[PDB]
Design a protein around this ligand. Structure first.
Ligand SMILES: Nc1nc2c(ncn2[C@@H]2O[C@H](COP(=O)(O)OP(=O)(O)OP(=O)(O)O)[C@@H](O)[C@H]2O)c(=O)[nH]1
Ligand SMILES: Nc1nc2c(ncn2[C@@H]2O[C@H](COP(=O)(O)OP(=O)(O)OP(=O)(O)O)[C@@H](O)[C@H]2O)c(=O)[nH]1
Ligand SMILES: [Mn+2]
Ligand SMILES: [Mn+2]
Ligand SMILES: [Mn+2]
Ligand SMILES: [Mn+2]
Lengths: 530, 530
């Protein structure tokens, strides 16, 4: 069936949508080719609609059926509980869209009688009505990127579809305990969300080294959420039901699947009907868990169809990496084509055709890749890195326009061991913090699904806990990594690494001069510049 | 061993401790004998120390051993998970004592890097050190009561013992999922915390009616927390371990038991060592679950020792109610004495000797009792009520001194069907809200462990959901109930029920005049006054 059917009404914004990077001095200090940085807006919604709208034809075979039975057997060992209204309220994120029913996320978190009474009413309706399609709002996402001339230049905005806040809290009551435990049990070491960057690296490196002659590939499904069929969503519900659940949870899971997850009406910010969805909604509680289970099921089956040898998979939602034993250059190329044809039959066609890789560093998944450097004693230390283009463009944007969200700080934390986060991001931002006497002001930081209130002076301790002390002494980075960073700097017009090393010595000196926690930042975060 | 051993250092306050009800006009409108209302303070801590300090001698027998094996078998069917630091932070109550380590409950709830880093460090220490006693603070509680001349007049302050905020969050990581599920599985219908007031009434009434010749009694253990022995606390840990838990959770449960739950050093608000505890701490996560399991285990065994017939128990922490088949007047009296002797052997001696009751209304447990009234159609409606002395004294106190906590509102909600909450509390407070134009201002309200932000206009919907529509039309209350309320009014100097009916007609008229939600309050909450 068609992933979407549209009416003609437009996907409208609900506030000011800025698309251009403002000519600012502080930002230009970091990046000069400002015209290459842009943000998506509702203006490009039409383009996105075209690419996410298509007919899905799905043909399953015994490989798929066998994997699904194996998964259900594992799911049958899971026990999960219903969350109470109060627990679901307390776990509601601080800045989610307010309800159309008169209350917002703050009221939910504070257990206001208005929110609590309304949620009880939504829950009761979920149990008593298992068919009426539930309303969802469709919006174009506003995200910052760097133009890619070698392609369509600017990419169109992603479309997010989500139900009202009251329903969102009810989804947690029914499924929070399921989505936070089921994938791990069913997929074991293949469940990517259980890993921190270093633990992800550890699993990838140990897996790579375990093969006699390793071969690996990333698989990029074209518009994954759109490829998810009704059958896929009902298969997900059948896996959830294998768990030992409370009677009300079963009834609510079934109702949410029928009324919301399989599809339903799309309403714009103006209240007009935009169309109908028959694929995955990006904004429901089960999007992550559902996509991970479905990707794992389809890929597991496709590995069997392709007779790939001793496969080990790593799955994060729609992102997939497979490492296996190589059967030879042309054998591998042929087997990957068979793998792709199976994925295509299962309704997960590729965006870019997958390619066999024999160098672990060249495999990119979750926009990241493993790389190697050396610690103080010269020992090899593997770590997770990524192309710094998007992180830098966003850092420049946030430097120019105050942002309730500080992605740059999230990048400094998640990519602390990297050459670019250490030399460019840390230097640039601490320079600013010192100049504005804001070294002690906490900043909101979105990382791994949660919004933290982070004090810059806590960075040393945060990095040590997440990455270990070696993150402060890594050196002798790989040539591929050094070259990628250097190229990105040229492309973006950001000063070369020598300019940053110089700027960092100044920053470090300034930190040491203050002693205390500030000195600690100077000692550990900038030990590399000395 | 001794429940406590003291040093001589005093239990000190940490702020202003008011003990007298201030002569105020608004409050005097409700209650005139203001000198009968008082609040406990650290001044009486010594008296409380005397009563909670004693040697425990415990002798177990096969009845106890058999019940414990039965309990472990049920516990073995429970699976529970570890909460992450972030989940435990989000479930931390908004107003708990700040940490000695530089952050408070707001920082925890907001995932501040300072709180998060510290908690990770406390957790790591729990896993790596399983012996060092953990520090706890001892404080005298400040609570409001009405003098009881027939006894010691004013009761001494209760003593609360609790670990630092960081440890408290770690207790949730290890045990939140266990304490919220294990008791229900082990004890079934006997677990009192699964019931709302009406559901508690339903279980008690159906149980009472199921007996050929019902007999029941409440059992009040003298200073229960002090009677809990080291063996009892280790028995609790052994039950927790029967659950299917994560390896880290097992290690943390064991460490918390050894370092904190079995006992440890007591520090006052001034930092001085006050003594050592070898019994239950009132302020740990496991106090409720632990007390409930232990009370249930000891009482189950004691029912067997006393050969009580077809017993059905209801347990809420240290509060216990038993309903059984009567064996005759003197047979019952004898059997209860045997029951008490068994409880005493198990280290749960009575405060007041239990007495057999053959009238369900006369059994008080959890400071409450079942009573009967009639609905619109004249049908019998059972509901939960209680002596209104404490609720009224507190309502008077809160009327005189603004209080971040509005217990009166919690009482209006929990006891909405009662004659006193409807005629006195609702009338008095809505009268005030109307006069101060605060009918639409939300108020903080502590109910069932959570702090809600309640809007008065939401009361009708709250009461309907919790008690049903009949709560707005109950009439023809029992003579025992009417007499108890009337007597309390005399004792306290609060105007008789006729004065309240008159005042309510005015309040109702004023509400109706406004229409909208206010009119709804007038129609439902005061329909009785017409
Ligand atoms: N602040 C600063 N910017 C620099 C410095 N060196 C280079 N840049 C900037 O970094 C970018 C260099 O990118 P390239 O494309 O390699 O430029 P180039 O090779 O210097 O070319 P020309 O400018 O024509 O000499 C430009 O935006 C420069 O302005 C430096 O020492 N300080
Ligand atoms: N506001 C108000 N208070 C009343 C009214 N009737 C009685 N009270 C108060 O309620 C209490 C009555 O308690 P009792 O001990 O029964 O007093 P009593 O029987 O009236 O005794 P006397 O005052 O000596 O006639 C006193 O505090 C009275 O002031 C009334 O109509 N209005
Ligand atoms: Mn994709
Ligand atoms: Mn992807
Ligand atoms: Mn007691
Ligand atoms: Mn009690």
């Amino acid at each position: 069936s068609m992933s979407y059917t549209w009416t003609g009404a437009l996907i409208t914004p609900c506030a000011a949508e800025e698309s251009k990077l403002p000519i600012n001095a502080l930002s230009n200090s970091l990046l000069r080719h400002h015209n290459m940085v842009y943000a998506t807006t509702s203006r490009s919604a039409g383009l996105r609609q075209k690419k996410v709208t298509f007919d899905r034809l799905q043909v399953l075979d015994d490989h798929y059926r066998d994997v699904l039975k194996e998964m259900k057997a594992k799911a049958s060992t899971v026990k999960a509980k219903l969350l109470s209204v109060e627990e679901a309220c307390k776990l509601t994120p601080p800045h989610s869209a307010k309800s159309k029913f008169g209350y917002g996320a703050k009221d939910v978190r504070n257990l206001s009688s208005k929110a609590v009474n309304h949620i009880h009413s939504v829950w009761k309706d979920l149990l008593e009505d298992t068919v009426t399609p539930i309303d969802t709002t469709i919006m174009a996402k506003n995200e910052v990127f760097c133009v890619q001339p070698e392609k369509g230049g600017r990419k169109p905005a992603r479309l997010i579809v989500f139900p009202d806040l009251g329903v969102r809290v009810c989804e947690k009551m029914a499924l929070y305990d399921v989505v936070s435990t089921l994938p791990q049990v069913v997929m074991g070491s293949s469940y990517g969300f259980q890993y921190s960057p270093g633990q992800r690296v550890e699993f990838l490196v140990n897996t790579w080294k375990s093969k006699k002659n390793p071969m690996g590939f990333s698989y990029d499904t074209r518009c994954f959420d759109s490829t998810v069929t009704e059958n896929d969503i009902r298969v997900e519900e059948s896996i959830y039901q294998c768990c030992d659940l409370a009677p009300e949870a079963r009834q609510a899971i079934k109702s949410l699947t029928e009324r919301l997850y399989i599809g339903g009406p799309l309403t714009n910010s103006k209240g007009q009907n935009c169309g109908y969805r028959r694929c995955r909604a990006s904004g429901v509680l089960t999007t992550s868990c559902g996509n991970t289970l479905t990707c794992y099921l389809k890929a597991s089956a496709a590995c069997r169809a392709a007779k790939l040898q001793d496969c080990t998979m790593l799955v994060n939602g729609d992102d997939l990496v497979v490492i296996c034993e190589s059967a030879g250059t042309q054998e591998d190329a042929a087997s990957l084509r068979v793998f792709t044809e199976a994925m295509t039959r299962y309704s997960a066609p590729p965006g870019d055709p997958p390619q066999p890789e024999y160098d672990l560093e060249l495999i990119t998944s979750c926009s990241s890749n493993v790389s190697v450097a050396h610690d103080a004693s010269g020992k090899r230390v593997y770590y997770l890195t990524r192309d710094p283009t998007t992180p830098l463009a966003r850092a420049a944007w946030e430097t120019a326009r105050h942002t309730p969200v500080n992605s740059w700080l999230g990048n400094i934390i998640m990519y602390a061991p990297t050459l670019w986060a250490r030399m460019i991001l840390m230097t640039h931002f601490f320079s600013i913090l010192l100049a504005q006497e804001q070294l002690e002001k906490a900043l909101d930081c979105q990382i791994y699904g949660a919004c933290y209130s982070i004090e810059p002076l806590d960075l040393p301790q945060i990095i040590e806990r997440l990455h270990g002390l070696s993150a402060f002494s890594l050196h002798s980075y790989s040539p591929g990594e050094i070259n990628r960073v250097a190229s990105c700097l040229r492309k973006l017009g950001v000063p070369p690494l020598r300019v940053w090393r110089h700027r960092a010595r100044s920053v470090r000196a300034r930190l040491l001069s203050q002693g205390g926690r500030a000195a600690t930042c100077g000692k550990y975060l900038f030990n590399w510049a000395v």
